[PDB]
């Protein structure tokens, strides 16, 4: 399903 | 950057006079996403025009599908009007039942 954000992918 | 949209006005099924059908306007390869699309019948905006959800291609160019229900004939003209930042004025593409 969608990607579950655990820590994040901040630029 | 900014890209000029492609306008494809066409029917879902082969046009038949008196037979119900679906008028479609497929606008693609444009950027940014901000864009206005209107389905016109005889120069006047149509009554019920909805559109698909915004999406993009592999080159990041967006594409949208504005559709409505219409019954093809030989007295009325149908067209697709599009306003975009890359367009100097609204572009209008008449529906040709040959395309």
């Amino acid at each position: 399903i969608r990607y579950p954000k655990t820590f994040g992918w901040l630029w | 950057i900014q890209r000029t949209p492609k306008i494809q006005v066409y029917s879902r099924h082969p046009p038949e006079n008196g037979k119900p059908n679906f008028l479609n306007c497929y606008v693609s390869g444009f950027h940014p996403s901000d864009i206005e699309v209107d389905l016109l019948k005889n120069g006047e905006k149509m009554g019920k025009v909805e559109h698909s959800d915004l999406s993009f291609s592999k080159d990041w160019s967006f594409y949208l599908l504005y559709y409505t229900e219409f019954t093809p004939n030989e007295k009325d003209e149908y067209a697709c009007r599009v306003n975009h930042v890359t367009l100097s004025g609204p572009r209008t593409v008449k529906w040709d039942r040959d395309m």
């Binding site: 990607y3 901040l10 630029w11 | 900014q2 479609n24 950027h31 993009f56």
Partner: protein, 276 residues
Amino acid sequence: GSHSMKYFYTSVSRPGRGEPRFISVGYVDDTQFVRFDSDAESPREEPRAPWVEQEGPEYWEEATRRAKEAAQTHRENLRTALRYYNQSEAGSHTIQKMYGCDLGPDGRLLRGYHQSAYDGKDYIALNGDLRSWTAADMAAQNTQRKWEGNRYAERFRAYLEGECLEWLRRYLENGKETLQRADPPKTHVTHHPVSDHEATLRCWALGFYPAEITLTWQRDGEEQTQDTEFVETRPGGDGTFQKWGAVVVPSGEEQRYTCHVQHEGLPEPLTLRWEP
């Protein structure tokens, strides 16, 4: 045989109008099945396919949660991007992101997708090895550094081999009727006289699925690229696709041209000729 599940995120900052516009869509192959619009009267994950409609409240709540999470993430990424490219908050900008997984015939991870662009140009993408990153410019190298620092590729990878594949499989099993379908295109040739010496032959392929298809024209058995027009594959608005190819032919040579259509829904490739 092989199937694919992809997600598309689009964030657009709008100065003076408040929070940025967040539009995301979910695809199984060429079939959209979910949507999330921040400008919806009730922002939440919604079904765009009959086969996903059977999912319980949990699916929609969790999906909405992840969607909004991504929304916030991109929301910070916009400002961070403003810092990177030394840009103003009075200008509109866009962050796009597509990511998916490819299920193979053996039921194993065939290919992975995770690429993001800023303002229409490549920003950063995940490599084939699903372990390293590729940045397009200097500003994206910062993001790459951070992601390398926090082992993000590992998490997204665990996602690719985990929930992604399993839920893709589940979807395929739920909507086999339309997802595992391979409808052949209804094709035909039409004639449209340009003048008294020229006429355009148009090859129509309608209501086919999936979208991938090949249309070519041949004069006496030789492919024609001159004076040929192929329109982009378009949606029928009902879950099918359309596409036609036209050739400008001098009157009297119509019977020397043939249309050629390659599609998955066809046992053998099609060879058409104008049938008045």
